[PDB]
Design a protein around this ligand. Sequence first.
Ligand code: HEM
Length: 153
Amino acid sequence: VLSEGEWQLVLHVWAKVEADVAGHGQDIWIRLFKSHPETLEKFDRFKHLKTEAEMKASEDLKKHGVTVLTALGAILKKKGHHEAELKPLAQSHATKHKIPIKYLEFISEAIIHVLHSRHPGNFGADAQGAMNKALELFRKDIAAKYKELGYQG
Ligand code: HEM
């Protein structure tokens, strides 16, 4: 459970991300694909992208980034009361896409890295700790749902 103070640090930096959702989306996914090339294998629609240049020029990847960050933002804004939002997300990722928890750990790393690079003034040590906590909570709850749905993760 996060304190109100920790949620405030998370939503404060998220407000900055929302000024440019598409841009943040691209940076985060490209970071993920570059650092962990294996994750690209999960997208039959992006598995053909060979360079960062092709990734940055992909309209479909940009759209995916917006879809993902909008869903994550909705969850964070619930401040822990995200049961309803997580159910459909857990079902599609465990049953259809088959995304292991390890990959959610990788994207969490990418998110923290991008926020640190683009928002140093609003992402000091305390704020990073709060964001890490919020993302760990998200991963812990999705993991619990994965189990209930029959997917090891
Ligand atoms: C911050 C965590 C993430 C959030 C909130 C998120 C959210 C979403 C949403 C809302 C969709 C569209 C609806 C759906 O199919 O459920 C989606 C699709 C998908 N996600 Fe996730 N996702 C996350 C992380 C990941 C990761 C780490 C991977 C893979 C390494 C992944 C792979 C996919 C795939 C393969 C699709 C379908 C893409 C397509 O065929 O159009 N997701 N995700």
